[PDB]
């Protein structure tokens, strides 16, 4: 009968400890609160979005402040290839004296943590040189995060609180966010590179004091307005340019060499300057497309509801019925949130795919552990953003979806043939798994019997071609920018392949991660990845499409998104809900990204050590994965502390065991289910009311066991945290112990 939780009278009238746990997992769910109307929903989400935005700037300011005050940034400028960076410092009272001596490292006074997130390489690239610029940018982000904390408070006051029609004005967001948030910010960063970062790259200090006096170019904005833009692409930084010095410098600010800087092995800063300038023009033009209050531009609701292609009657755009989709995207918030996580989930992995092969930061290709961590980080982030895309897409079909408004359109036609989607998804998952596992076990038995020539090894001849159709001479396919007589190589009418002499130097060197040499070991793992993508999608799509009911249980929409079961009847319905198909998929999604990051990590341990033959022989059969990668690399890690002493890897040796324990704890919530435990707690309730001194005190909330949906959350939480921390302790210390 308490007044907590405030947002629910049905939870606040719960005598048990279920009141406490369901407050936490329904607190930020604004749509299920008591008395929440429609316009009060958007006005609360919009000001909450100022709260998460200001956490990000307060987070990024502690990266600047803990490096400026406790790191060795100014000592890292002198030699970035051997000086080992510092994240923050340790004040741990529980340390012993051999564990202060082991972490006093990288030339520091006290125990410091070696930074493996690569933020020294990004700050050194964009012009920052001393510890005062790091502190100045830190204090600026304190004020810039408080400017959003005040903005969220301001837009909750009654005449400053926006109306409902302001939120559902979707054509005006697309004009302002594309032109301004995307386009001007890409234009502003191109202004930051040309005025500041590229002159800082040439030993020439340009700060806040002297940027109004100094010009980035001795021509100085006269060739801009006259149309003589080729002056900006004069004498570039040469191939003997020592970075942040004046040796081999240039005067060009917008250049188009393509390929890598010869020392830092990163992209040229003049290439990035013409990039974000060209991206900015393509987006400001893109932001003048949709119709606002100025009576001009395209209208999306008319583009959906159009039925006539130049007089010919059609069903819609591409002769496909897209009517009502404008009132489906814009009216629902779970359709938007489920959509944009798929958009952000694609680009997040797409960030990671292009940052190991195309490094853009000074001296980051030679600092190995910072590069192995940034790939695996943004891959796991891309995992949750894709699982939550289908998760919040399936909350849409239960809660927000209306079949009458969406009648006859393309989203209705998917729900008709949904048994044909799940069947052919079930085919490819079984067609790959029966024949990919079959060829590893075939190669395992064949090598075990001492006759390894009977292996089934397939060259990836369809991705051999693409790397030779991008200019790799190493295979001898002789096509398409590797054929010097090609029409694509020469660009026959105009001959304007400026990028191409610098691109073919980068792709034909064996000293970078640009289009790595692939063989039969890489054939099996990309088809093992394709096993993991079509199977994780199988669980998520089938939970999305069957979210509104099926044969075993109709009207599943009447029970919401997360409900345990429907009893033992009809054979039982354990894990039937649409939430439960979110749940099964995150085992696969953590699995598949294991495969894509075990394979990423072990191909690069051959490149970084000069032993490419270890991977190409042993990655065809599953013992070579188990022996030469899991067994052989965990020798530096596990000896982080032994009865002889410690070293600087003893946190990662402790976190590795810590991860194996959180992982194993989560099995207890999943194998064992609730009704064992409610019959156990009822014996502890008995033996507390009978103990003579200890029954002076008594609970306010009656102890009950965790509910069925709850310990699938708590079981998946211990599983996922332990999956992350185990590999993240193995990824770092097996790389940072070998270099």
């Amino acid at each position: 009968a308490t007044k907590f939780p405030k947002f629910s009278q049905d939870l606040a009238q719960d005598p048990t400890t279920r009141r406490i746990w369901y407050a936490m997992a329904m607190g930020n769910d604004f749509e299920s609160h008591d008395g929440m109307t429609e316009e009060n929903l958007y006005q609360k989400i919009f000001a909450t979005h100022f709260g998460h935005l200001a956490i990000i700037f307060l987070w990024a300011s502690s990266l600047l402040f803990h490096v400026a005050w406790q790191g060795n940034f100014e000592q890292w400028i002198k030699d970035p290839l051997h000086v080992r960076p510092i994240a923050h410092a340790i004040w741990d009272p529980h340390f012993g004296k051999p564990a202060i001596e082991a972490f006093t490292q990288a030339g520091a006074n006290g125990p410091v943590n070696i930074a493996y997130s690569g933020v020294y390489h990004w700050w050194y690239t964009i012009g920052m040189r001393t510890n005062t610029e790091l502190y100045t940018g830190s204090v600026f982000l304190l004020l810039f995060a408080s400017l959003f904390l005040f903005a969220g408070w301001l837009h909750l006051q009654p005449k400053f609180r926006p109306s409902l029609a302001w939120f559902k004005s979707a054509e005006s967001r697309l004009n302002h966010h594309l032109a301004g948030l995307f386009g001007v910010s890409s234009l502003a960063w191109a202004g930051h590179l040309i005025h500041v970062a590229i002159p800082e790259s040439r030993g020439q200090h340009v700060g806040w004091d002297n940027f109004l006096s100094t010009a980035p170019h001795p021509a100085g904005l006269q060739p801009f307005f006259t149309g003589n833009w080729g002056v900006y692409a004069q004498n570039p930084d040469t191939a003997g340019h020592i970075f942040s010095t004046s040796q081999g410098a240039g005067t060009a600010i917008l250049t188009f060499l393509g390929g890598f800087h010869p020392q830092t092995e990163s992209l040229w800063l003049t290439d990035m300057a013409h990039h974000h300038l060209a991206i900015a023009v393509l987006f400001i033009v893109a932001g003048h497309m949709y119709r606002t209050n100025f009576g001009i531009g395209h209208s999306i609701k008319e583009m959906m509801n159009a039925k006539t292609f130049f007089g010919k009657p059609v069903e819609g755009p591409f002769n496909m019925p897209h009517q009502g989709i404008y009132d489906t995207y814009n009216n629902s918030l779970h359709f938007q949130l489920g959509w944009h996580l798929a958009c952000l989930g694609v680009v997040t992995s797409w960030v990671a795919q292009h940052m190991y092969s195309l490094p853009s930061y000074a001296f980051i290709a030679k600092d190995y552990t910072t590069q192995a961590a940034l790939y695996t980080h943004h891959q796991y982030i891309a995992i949750f953003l894709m699982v939550g895309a289908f998760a919040h897409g399936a909350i849409f079909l239960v809660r927000d979806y209306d079949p009458e408004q969406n009648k006859g359109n393309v989203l209705e036609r998917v729900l008709q043939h949904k048994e044909a989607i799940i069947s052919h998804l079930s085919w490819v998952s079984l067609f790959l798994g029966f024949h990919t596992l079959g060829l590893y076990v075939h190669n395992d038995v064949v090598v075990a019997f001492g006759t390894p020539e009977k292996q089934i090894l397939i060259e990836p001849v369809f991705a051999q071609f693409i790397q030779a159709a991008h200019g790799k001479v190493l295979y001898g396919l002789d096509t398409l920018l590797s054929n010097p007589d090609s029409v694509a190589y020469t660009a026959y009418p105009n001959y304007a392949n400026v990028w191409l002499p610098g691109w073919l130097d980068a792709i034909n060197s064996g000293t970078n991660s640009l289009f790595l040499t692939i063989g039969p070991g890489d054939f099996l793992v990309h088809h093992a990845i394709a096993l993991g993508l079509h199977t994780t999608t199988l669980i998520l799509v089938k939970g999305a499409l069957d979210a509104r009911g099926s044969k075993l249980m109709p009207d599943k929409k009447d029970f919401g998104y997360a409900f345990p079961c429907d009893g033992p009847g009809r054979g039982g319905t354990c894990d039937i809900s649409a939430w439960d198909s979110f749940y099964l998929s995150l085992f696969w999604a953590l699995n598949t990204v294991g495969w894509v990051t075990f394979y990423w990590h072990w191909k690069h341990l051959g490149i970084w050590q000069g032993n490419v033959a270890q991977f190409n022989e042993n990655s065809t059969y599953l013992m070579g994965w188990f022996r030469d990668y899991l067994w052989a690399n965990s020798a530096q890690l596990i000896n982080g502390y032994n009865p002889y002493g410690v070293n600087n890897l003893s946190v990662w040796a402790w976190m590795f065991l810590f991860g194996h324990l959180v992982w194993a704890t989560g099995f207890m919530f999943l194998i064992s289910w609730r009704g064992y435990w409610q019959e156990l707690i009822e014996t502890l309730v008995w033996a507390h009311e009978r103990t003579p001194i200890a029954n002076l005190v008594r609970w306010k909330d009656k102890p009950v066991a965790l509910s069925i949906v709850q310990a699938r959350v708590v079981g998946l939480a211990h599983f996922t945290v332990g999956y992350v921390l185990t590999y993240a302790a193995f990824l770092i210390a097996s790389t940072a112990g070998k270099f």
Binding site: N319, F465, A469, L477, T479, L480, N483, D485, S486
Partner: peptide, 29 residues
Amino acid sequence: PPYTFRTGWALLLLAVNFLVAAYYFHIIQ
């Protein structure tokens, strides 16, 4: 009916599948 609009775009995409294989089989260079 003979599905003209469906087969019209499937034969366009399959013509792209056959064109790239002509580069890979050195039919076109």
